[PDB]
């Protein structure tokens, strides 16, 4: 048997256990991708991932639920990346190149306000769609009634890199009786049955925060509710910029929060950027993570 | 996208382009398992092999055919750790270890008889069967009349690693008239329808040398005939110790050539020691290397 250590870090968060796990092994070089995805099982957290050396950037990285390899995963990289450079395992630079499977990642390294490093990355153009379904069933699906919806904001598809529904509520009071009948999506969702689901609203627990929201997985991903979900808060800025303040000239940021519900106190920091000679808006994230545990794994 | 540097060494041999190719890649580091298998096919050689970080050995390494993934190669072993320490990338040791999907390698390195630098190996403690087939196939098998055998030594199946079958012929003349029909090996070999035929005779073209073998492949292989056959040369040891001569004290020493049938001269050192906690042969072998090429490849 072989011992590895393996390293659990909570991304989008700044106090332990508030955040979306990110496990890590902060030198794989030593490991075949039989053993990662072994490795990845036993650790047992929604994701671990794994750092490599590569040809053609400064490191390569790569990703694996319990179950499978993924080609990309944003609060994996948010998690490892400021791993790598609190514990001082990068070089002296603000800025990195991760080969991952799905090409060579830039990333951005800096310090927000309160001096913690902060992990940046951009990500897929925003796509939206609009909600064409019934919005009693899509109600009775996250279970509330119809008049808990916000009337006055739409109910669209979106994606920067995966697709989710944001279903703007009322106010925090809704978001807290939400209860997810995830089986039941598919029938609601015609136009794309196996998005996600992530209501929003623009009340918000934390003072510094300008949207809330949660999130209930597709119906065909096993579980329930993520903690902190990068792709979706990226949309949700698109969101924001388009639909709620468009007011903007070039750049504008919004932090998001989630997972006060579950009590977990997750934060996205979203970036939206738009240029002459670009048709959509850019949209970068951004969060910071910190130390959880380490522990032993044998393989 | 990646131009990876790969080198050519001969193993069990002095002389360039006389013994068995293994393609090199001194530090795999950067790659996948794809690549790695990518690069395999693009070389062409039987095996490449890949130098990788380990954890709890020297170094790691993988092997590959053009086509899938060996567990072992023992002219690969000889031919990389030859080359990386002709290179300087190994601190220059008598003994190091290597990490294997298979398991940790222990290996020896000196200075051999002939004054050149070995690279010495463990194989696994000798296993035999009777050949109980038809003698007359198996002749023809091999492009040669039943009268071109030897009588006077056993056909068996012989393993310290891989299964061969040793076919004792008559001498040199009847060994330079074989020709393989590798394809019907498996009808012709009954009880183990996947090794590889290896005949033999005491008979060598040098006089400082014990036993003459040649190495067709089995019908499963990518190749016809292997240049000079680290596997079955420690079974031709075993082979020598166990039906030839008995009698020795504790330990002898055998030089095994192959290769001149195809205009190469491979040879390989073969040590059996009478072990007294296994109350079996042990088997190691050895033998040198040899630079032949450096080249690019673009994957
Ligand atoms: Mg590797």
Same mark, same amino acid.
């Given at each position: 048997?072989?011992?590895?250590?393996?390293?659990?870090?909570?991304?989008?968060?700044?106090?332990?256990? =508030?955040?979306?796990? *990110?496990?890590?092994?902060? %030198?794989?070089? $030593?490991?075949? @991708? &039989?053993?990662?995805?072994? /490795?990845?099982?036993?650790?047992?957290?929604?994701?671990?991932?794994?750092?490599?050396?590569?040809?053609?950037?400064?490191?390569?990285?790569?990703?694996?639920?319990?179950?499978?390899?993924?080609?990309?995963?944003?609060?994996?990289?948010?998690?490892?990346?400021?791993?790598?450079?609190?514990?001082?395992?990068?070089?002296?630079?603000?800025?990195?190149?991760?080969?991952?499977?799905?090409?060579?990642?830039?990333?951005?390294?800096?310090?927000?306000?309160?001096?913690?490093?902060?992990?940046? =990355?951009?990500?897929? *153009?925003?796509?939206?769609? %609009?909600?064409? $379904?019934?919005? @009693? &069933?899509?109600?009775?699906? /996250?279970?509330?009634?119809?008049?808990?919806?916000?009337?006055?904001?739409?109910?669209?598809?979106?994606?920067?890199?995966?697709?989710?529904?944001?279903?703007?509520?009322?106010?925090?009071?809704?978001?807290?009786?939400?209860?997810?009948?995830?089986?039941?999506?598919?029938?609601?969702?015609?136009?794309?049955?196996?998005?996600?689901?992530?209501?929003?609203?623009?009340?918000?627990?934390?003072?510094?925060?300008?949207?809330?929201?949660?999130?209930?997985?597709?119906?065909?991903?096993?579980?329930?509710?993520?903690?902190?979900?990068?792709?979706?808060?990226?949309?949700?800025?698109?969101?924001?910029?388009?639909?709620?303040?468009?007011?903007?000239?070039?750049?504008?940021?919004?932090?998001?929060?989630?997972?006060?519900?579950?009590?977990?106190?997750?934060?996205?920091?979203?970036?939206?950027?738009?240029?002459?000679?670009?048709?959509?808006?850019?949209?970068?994230?951004?969060?910071?993570?910190?130390?959880?545990?380490?522990?032993?794994?044998?393989?």
């Amino acid at each position: 048997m072989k011992t590895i250590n393996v390293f659990h870090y909570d991304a989008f968060t700044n106090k332990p256990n =508030m955040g979306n796990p *990110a496990g890590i092994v902060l %030198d794989a070089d $030593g490991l075949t @991708e &039989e053993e990662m995805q072994r /490795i990845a099982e036993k650790v047992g957290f929604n994701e671990t991932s794994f750092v490599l050396s590569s040809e053609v950037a400064d490191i390569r990285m790569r990703y694996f639920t319990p179950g499978y390899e993924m080609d990309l995963c944003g609060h994996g990289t948010v998690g490892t990346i400021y791993a790598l450079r609190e514990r001082g395992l990068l070089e002296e630079k603000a800025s990195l190149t991760i080969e991952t499977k799905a090409g060579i990642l830039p990333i951005q390294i800096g310090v927000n306000e309160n001096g913690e490093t902060f992990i940046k =990355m951009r990500q897929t *153009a925003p796509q939206f769609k %609009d909600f064409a $379904g019934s919005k @009693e &069933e899509l109600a009775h699906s /996250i279970g509330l009634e119809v008049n808990d919806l916000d009337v006055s904001l739409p109910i669209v598809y979106g994606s920067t890199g995966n697709w989710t529904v944001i279903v703007p509520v009322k106010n925090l009071d809704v978001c807290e009786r939400m209860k997810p009948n995830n089986e039941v999506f598919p029938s609601v969702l015609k136009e794309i049955p196996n998005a996600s689901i992530h209501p929003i609203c623009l009340e918000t627990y934390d003072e510094k925060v300008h949207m809330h929201g949660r999130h209930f997985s597709s119906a065909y991903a096993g579980t329930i509710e993520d903690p902190v979900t990068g792709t979706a808060s990226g949309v949700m800025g698109a969101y924001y910029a388009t639909y709620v303040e468009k007011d903007f000239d070039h750049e504008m940021e919004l932090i998001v929060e989630q997972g006060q519900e579950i009590h977990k106190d997750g934060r996205v920091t979203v970036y939206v950027t738009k240029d002459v000679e670009s048709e959509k808006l850019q949209i970068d994230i951004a969060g910071t993570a910190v130390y959880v545990k380490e522990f032993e794994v044998l393989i």
